């Protein structure tokens, strides 16, 4: 008399199977969902129940749409669509593994990596470490990471939020990259004092060596130029505090701090990346909007959906969101590839010349954020969020990818440090190579 209606697949861009569902017999028919990939983008996919229903992950949010609705008999079965993301099974399985081994090598506790589309915005890769294998019961699996920290998990960026000053700055005409500063170690601000994480003296720096260096104490001073107001104006057009609508459940909005609530401090922290909160997704996001000559895309990982029939509707595509002219955007990529830059001297490195890409016009930026003390409500004195995040390339953008590793005892390859700038080296650059990307001066920041 019931006549069941048969779940939909959920599969990559190129119609790479993710989970597709077998008949089976036992109640005797059995319908078996099958994940051919195991544990690959299951942080994405999810896992079915024992009904064959959702249990988490996509499989749940979308459940209604892959699960279709049974008929009886008359009442037809509409069977469930297929449900085509955004994501390329080739790139999400080379990340994948590759935060894995950054894990582990680096000794973080763990590590996740987005990988948009520059363009569009759309989620290419999204992945984090210790992902659990929706193939098996998922009761035997409390060790296993079930969700999507990418989406769910906010932290405080430290520097990767100087993105937002460089804009706001270059943007409204306050400064130029190779405007020589004075920046002096320490500063009295908003009642506090920022100091640079190196001792110093007033130093020459240009503005491009201010971000390039990573000076908070640079950062802050232009910052003063901007202003509180078109500062916090900044922030919401890169998108900070709010979701992104990616489609995916569990997505966190971030905290950002509205400017009617600001203490006399708060100016003083959140341009260096301090007093706010975002995911990976949103800081990825930010760097989006500055590789697609300013105009912001917001993410999405739900490419299409195919109807029983066969015929397939794309998903809308979300509006533009203007954040910088494309010539301040093209000015602030040129500027951060003096992140990635190496220099024997010292004089003229930034802080990730592991990042860099030879033949290859890398830009991205480092953070070393400190993490709070959950028993004091304090900053601990040795624990890190540590991020990157990069496009690839600064003239031609295609690729924007962002990491985060939660506390590392070492690099990201596992030599001494606590950068994920390796992490970034290997991904652009293979990304590079895979579809045969053909390969001036070196930037000043710092004057005489
Ligand atoms: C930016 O990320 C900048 N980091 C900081 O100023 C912060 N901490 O710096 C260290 C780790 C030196 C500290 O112990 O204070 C910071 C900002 S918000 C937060 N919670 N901590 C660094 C120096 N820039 S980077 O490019 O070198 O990463
Ligand atoms: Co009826
Ligand atoms: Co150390
Ligand atoms: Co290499």
């Known amino acids: ?37 195991g544990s690959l983008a299951a942080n994405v996919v999810g896992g079915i129940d024992w009904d064959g229903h959702g ?6 949010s979308l459940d209604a749409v892959l699960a279709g609705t049974d008929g009886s008999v008359r009442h037809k079965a509409v069977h ?5 993301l955004t994501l390329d099974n080739d790139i999400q399985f080379y990340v994948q593994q590759q935060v894995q081994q950054a894990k582990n090598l680096s000794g973080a506790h763990n590590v996740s990596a987005v990988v948009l589309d520059a363009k569009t915005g759309e989620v290419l890769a999204m992945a984090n470490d210790n992902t659990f294998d929706p193939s098996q019961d998922i009761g035997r699996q409390g060790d296993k990471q079930l969700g999507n920290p990418a989406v769910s998990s906010p932290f405080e960026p430290g520097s990767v939020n100087k993105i937002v000053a460089a804009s706001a700055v270059i943007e409204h005409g306050l400064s130029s990259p190779d405007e020589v500063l004075q920046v002096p170690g320490s500063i009295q601000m908003g009642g506090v004092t920022v100091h640079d994480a190196w001792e110093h003296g007033v130093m020459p720096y ?27 104006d900044m922030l919401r ?40 909160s975002m995911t990976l997704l949103q800081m990825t ?29 794309e998903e809308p595509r979300p509006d533009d969101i203007r954040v910088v002219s494309a010539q301040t955007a093209q000015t602030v ?38 993490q709070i003390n959950p028993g004091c409500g304090c900053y601990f004195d040795d624990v890190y969020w540590i991020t990157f995040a990069g496009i690839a390339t600064a003239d031609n953008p295609r690729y924007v990818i962002g990491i ?39 930037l000043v920041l710092q004057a005489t």
């Open 404 to 442: 985060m590793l939660d506390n590392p005892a070492r690099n990201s390859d596992g030599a001494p440090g606590h950068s994920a700038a390796p992490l970034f080296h290997n991904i652009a650059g293979w990304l590079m190579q895979r579809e045969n990307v053909p390969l001036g001066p070196p």
């Open 80 to 84: 469930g669509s297929t449900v085509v």
């Open 55 to 60: 249990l988490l992950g996509l499989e749940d």
């Open 285 to 313: 996001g930010m760097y989006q909007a500055i590789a697609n000559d300013g105009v912001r895309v917001p993410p999405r990982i739900i490419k299409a959906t195919v109807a029983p029939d066969g015929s397939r509707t």
């Open 237 to 276: 057009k890169f998108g900070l505090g709010q979701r992104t609508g990616v489609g995916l459940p569990g997505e966190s909005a971030g905290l950002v701090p509205p400017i009617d609530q600001w203490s006399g401090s708060t100016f003083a922290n959140l341009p260096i990346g301090q007093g706010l």
């Open 206 to 232: 240009t503005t491009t060596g201010v971000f390039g260096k990573s000076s908070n104490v640079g950062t802050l001073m232009l910052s003063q130029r901007v202003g509180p107001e078109r500062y916090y």
């Open 1 to 37: 008399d019931v006549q069941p209606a048969a779940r939909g697949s959920i599969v990559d861009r190129n119609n790479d199977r993710l989970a597709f569902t077998i008949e089976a017999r036992a109640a005797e028919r059995q319908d078996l969902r099958q994940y051919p990939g």
């Open 333 to 370: 990529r040129q500027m951060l590839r003096a992140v990635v830059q190496r220099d024997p001297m010292g004089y003229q490195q930034g802080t990730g010349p592991t990042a860099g890409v030879p033949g290859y016009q890398m830009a991205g930026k480092t953070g070393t954020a400190q």
